Write an enzyme that holds these catalytic residues in place. Structure first.
Site, PDB file in Angstrom:
ATOM      1  N   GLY A  50       4.259  10.634   4.874  1.00 39.12           N
ATOM      2  CA  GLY A  50       3.589  11.722   4.585  1.00 39.12           C
ATOM      3  C   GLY A  50       3.754  11.931   2.825  1.00 39.12           C
ATOM      4  N   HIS A  52      -6.045   5.191   1.791  1.00 34.65           N
ATOM      5  CA  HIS A  52      -5.593   4.884   3.324  1.00 34.65           C
ATOM      6  C   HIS A  52      -5.502   5.951   4.101  1.00 34.65           C
ATOM      7  CE1 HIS A  52      -1.271   5.430   1.343  1.00 34.65           C
ATOM      8  NE2 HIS A  52      -0.949   5.857   2.832  1.00 34.65           N
ATOM      9  N   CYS A  79       2.612  10.111   0.327  1.00 33.23           N
ATOM     10  CA  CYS A  79       1.480   9.286  -0.510  1.00 33.23           C
ATOM     11  C   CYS A  79       0.664  10.555  -1.131  1.00 33.23           C
ATOM     12  CB  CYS A  79       0.728   8.258   0.448  1.00 33.23           C
ATOM     13  SG  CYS A  79       1.835   7.035   0.361  1.00 33.23           S
TER      14      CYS A  79
HETATM   15  C1  LIG Z   1       2.625   7.405   2.072  1.00 32.92           C
HETATM   16  N1  LIG Z   1       2.296   8.362   2.792  1.00 32.92           N
HETATM   17  C2  LIG Z   1       3.238   6.079   2.624  1.00 32.92           C
HETATM   18  C3  LIG Z   1       4.488   6.102   1.743  1.00 32.92           C
HETATM   19  C4  LIG Z   1       6.186   5.864   2.384  1.00 32.92           C
HETATM   20  C5  LIG Z   1       6.406   5.265   3.725  1.00 32.92           C
HETATM   21  C6  LIG Z   1       7.907   4.783   3.639  1.00 32.92           C
HETATM   22  N2  LIG Z   1       8.180   4.904   2.093  1.00 32.92           N
HETATM   23  C7  LIG Z   1       7.075   5.303   1.429  1.00 32.92           C
HETATM   24  O1  LIG Z   1       6.793   5.385   0.157  1.00 32.92           O
HETATM   25  C8  LIG Z   1       7.953   3.457   3.914  1.00 32.92           C
HETATM   26  O2  LIG Z   1       8.644   3.010   4.973  1.00 32.92           O
HETATM   27  N3  LIG Z   1       7.006   2.593   3.708  1.00 32.92           N
HETATM   28  C9  LIG Z   1       7.129   1.131   4.012  1.00 32.92           C
HETATM   29  C10 LIG Z   1       5.981   0.637   4.782  1.00 32.92           C
HETATM   30  C11 LIG Z   1       6.581  -0.738   5.608  1.00 32.92           C
HETATM   31  C12 LIG Z   1       5.430   1.499   5.769  1.00 32.92           C
HETATM   32  C13 LIG Z   1       4.785   0.232   3.770  1.00 32.92           C
HETATM   33  N4  LIG Z   1       5.145  -0.967   2.906  1.00 32.92           N
HETATM   34  C14 LIG Z   1       4.493  -1.899   2.796  1.00 32.92           C
HETATM   35  O3  LIG Z   1       3.646  -2.561   3.734  1.00 32.92           O
HETATM   36  O4  LIG Z   1       4.893  -2.857   1.689  1.00 32.92           O
HETATM   37  C15 LIG Z   1       4.301  -4.130   1.836  1.00 32.92           C
HETATM   38  C16 LIG Z   1       5.206  -4.910   2.614  1.00 32.92           C
HETATM   39  C17 LIG Z   1       5.038  -5.227   4.072  1.00 32.92           C
HETATM   40  C18 LIG Z   1       5.834  -5.599   5.164  1.00 32.92           C
HETATM   41  C19 LIG Z   1       7.279  -5.945   4.707  1.00 32.92           C
HETATM   42  C20 LIG Z   1       7.562  -5.839   3.371  1.00 32.92           C
HETATM   43  C21 LIG Z   1       6.843  -5.047   2.654  1.00 32.92           C
HETATM   44  C22 LIG Z   1       4.226   1.386   3.099  1.00 32.92           C
HETATM   45  O5  LIG Z   1       4.546   2.093   2.397  1.00 32.92           O
HETATM   46  N5  LIG Z   1       2.749   1.513   3.562  1.00 32.92           N
HETATM   47  C23 LIG Z   1       2.106   0.614   4.630  1.00 32.92           C
HETATM   48  C24 LIG Z   1       0.595   1.243   4.657  1.00 32.92           C
HETATM   49  C25 LIG Z   1       0.716   2.663   3.559  1.00 32.92           C
HETATM   50  C26 LIG Z   1       1.949   2.732   2.791  1.00 32.92           C
HETATM   51  C27 LIG Z   1       2.711   3.892   3.318  1.00 32.92           C
HETATM   52  O6  LIG Z   1       3.403   4.073   4.385  1.00 32.92           O
HETATM   53  N6  LIG Z   1       2.639   4.996   2.321  1.00 32.92           N
HETATM   54  C28 LIG Z   1      -0.051   1.379   2.915  1.00 32.92           C
HETATM   55  C29 LIG Z   1       0.295   0.094   1.971  1.00 32.92           C
HETATM   56  C30 LIG Z   1      -1.484   1.245   3.078  1.00 32.92           C
END
Ligand SMILES: *C(=N)[C@@H]1C[C@H]2C[C@H](NC2=O)C(=O)NCC(C)(C)[C@H](NC(=O)OCc2ccccc2)C(=O)N2C[C@H]3[C@@H]([C@H]2C(=O)N1)C3(C)C
Ligand SMILES: *C(=N)[C@@H]1C[C@H]2C[C@H](NC2=O)C(=O)NCC(C)(C)[C@H](NC(=O)OCc2ccccc2)C(=O)N2C[C@H]3[C@@H]([C@H]2C(=O)N1)C3(C)C
EC number: 3.4.19.12
Lengths: 305, 305
Positions: A143, A41, A145
């Site tokens: 950041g 991603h 990941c």
């Molecule tokens: C990596 N750099 C990053 C990791 C972090 C972002 C933060 N915590 C992390 O571990 C966070 O707030 N993450 C949550 C969000 C919403 C940004 C998503 N999670 C997600 O989509 O989970 C499913 C979901 C959707 C809606 C409601 C509830 C659950 C998330 O972690 N990420 C969205 C996007 C990357 C990832 C991310 O930000 N990773 C990917 C899944 C491609």
């Protein structure tokens, strides 16, 4: 004596951390020999992440679109490929700091150390378990990941985890180093939910053995039980069923203490049914399930790397 | 999100660890430039440790009596001296892995990472606080002495602790890197006891701010208090008095959350008087006092090294 949640020394992994940028997205990569592993991603815009077609997105990316930085110095990307949920960036330089390493896909209930990183730079280290529901309870921001989880066996680093995402309850999901998720999670920003957070029964017993080794003995009782009897109690409290394989893995701690696993199960049963009555065990007011039998033996015998 | 007890990355310290043997006693040393620092009780027989005359014992020791090993390779000792409770062994080689470093004597209530070592080899890493009673709650066995505690500020390692001994309650005492004990402890196997284990009030408030930042909000109430009023409650529960200096250090976390420190003190007061009613805060069933305000900001903002 004393008993602490204890991470592996992080030096061997620190030397493998790099920064990866594609477009405006920056995250961490792991540089081993002439390959950098990172979450796929990295190629996504914030908007792409709602419903990404990773193969289609990757068409638009060439080797030069992957900016890889090891501390202050740029690595030259001479090849790229997607394997499941990870990208493999081939670089023109073998990492001179590459340790002896393996990729392992860990079982639920096993522990590992996380080296939390931002911009390819380490922030900190902590211990996690792969939970029965295939999540971990970490500490991850934007950041983070590409931060990895690992174990060390003397000189060999076993990488088992790469960080990809956060679910509600602020729990964490990611992949092994072949890019396969733990659990049913996908790398898309759409509603996903963790299943029941089951307690790792064998780990709670291992930690009760650590407490005894440390002279925290108040919870030992006059009772015993059977596997089937204990498991009828386990089930009510969302504990994993205990099997003879678990009993056998607890053999070193049972032998060291002279307490039969089934007698310790009878102590655990009383703690589940009666609570701790405001008492503590190894300074905790809850039953701890993120130490494996091997973690207890490692810590209580002073095993080094 | 998420909030973990988080150690510094240990790599910069791992490269400084060596083994020191004098007679039959082996413990760890810290190799910085051309000096190895280690606990002076390396020169003692088990019997000597009951009532040692360190100056008299040291007469019988020459440079060649100090066997110093950095991984598999012997260092040549060209000088030795005692400073308080540490020996300084001058070696003929500057440690090529020496990081940017300082020696600091930390204040009670500050945290640091411990790299637990045996035979000059790292076992693991964990976070500790210097407790108000000048002990730490570590994890140390035979052979652990000379393991150090440190902080990192970007590229600079601040060494603050060297491990020397264990007291009853399985708590730990040691020195700064000038060999001066924290607290009144001496390096002799005679009855010594820790004082009252006071709770680091400013740290509990910092951790309550971490909980809010993480969406664990149930304990926020409709009340406020005053410093003097809160402190009358602190005192009953063996909490450190809170001062305006503490309030000022909590300024970043108060500003980020919009919760006045005195309103958070009113929440803490209810938790001390009423307990947690079987609820948890950041997965703990007790109030945590080993995170400093700076630890909370570091972890919640993703500061790197
Ligand atoms: C990596 N750099 C990053 C990791 C972090 C972002 C933060 N915590 C992390 O571990 C966070 O707030 N993450 C949550 C969000 C919403 C940004 C998503 N999670 C997600 O989509 O989970 C499913 C979901 C959707 C809606 C409601 C509830 C659950 C998330 O972690 N990420 C969205 C996007 C990357 C990832 C991310 O930000 N990773 C990917 C899944 C491609
Ligand atoms: C360093 N290699 C070693 C550290 C560890 C030994 C172990 N835990 C440690 O941290 C332990 O069991 N330590 C307890 C003993 C009794 C061995 C003493 N503590 C001590 O004497 O404290 C005062 C006391 C005496 C009698 C009863 C109650 C308290 C201890 O830690 N050490 C004795 C000897 C060295 C030190 C030691 O073993 N360090 C020195 C103090 C010189």
């Amino acid at each position: 004596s004393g008993f602490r949640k204890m991470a592996f020394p992080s030096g061997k992994v620190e030397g493998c951390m790099v920064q990866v940028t594609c477009g405006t997205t920056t995250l961490n990569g792991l540089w081993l020999d002439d390959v950098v592993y990172c979450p796929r991603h990295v190629i996504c815009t914030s908007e792409d992440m709602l419903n990404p077609n990773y193969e289609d997105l990757l068409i638009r990316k060439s080797n030069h679109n992957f900016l890889v930085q090891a501390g202050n110095v740029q690595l030259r990307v001479i090849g790229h490929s997607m394997q499941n949920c990870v990208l493999k960036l081939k670089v023109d330089t073998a990492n001179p700091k590459t340790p002896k390493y393996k990729f392992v896909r860990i079982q639920p209930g096993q522990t590992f150390s996380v080296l939390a990183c931002y911009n390819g730079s380490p922030s900190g280290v902590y211990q996690c378990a792969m939970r029965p529901n295939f999540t971990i309870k970490g500490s991850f921001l934007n950041g983070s990941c590409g931060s990895v989880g690992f174990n060390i066996d003397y000189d060999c680093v076993s990488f088992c985890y790469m960080h990809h995402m956060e679910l509600p309850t602020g729990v964490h999901a990611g992949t092994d180093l072949e890019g396969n998720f733990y659990g049913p999670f996908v790398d898309r920003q759409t509603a996903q939910a963790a299943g029941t957070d089951t307690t790792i029964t064998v780990n709670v017993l291992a930690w009760l053995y650590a407490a005894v080794i440390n002279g925290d003995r108040w919870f030992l009782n006059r009772f015993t039980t059977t596997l089937n009897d204990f498991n009828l109690v386990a089930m009510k409290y969302n504990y994993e069923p205990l099997t003879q394989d678990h009993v056998d893995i607890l053999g070193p701690l049972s032998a060291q203490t002279g307490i039969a696993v089934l007698d310790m199960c009878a102590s655990l049963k009383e703690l589940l049914q009666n609570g701790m009555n405001g008492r503590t065990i190894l300074g905790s007011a809850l039953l701890e399930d993120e130490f494996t039998p091997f973690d207890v033996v490692r810590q209580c015998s002073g095993v080094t790397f």
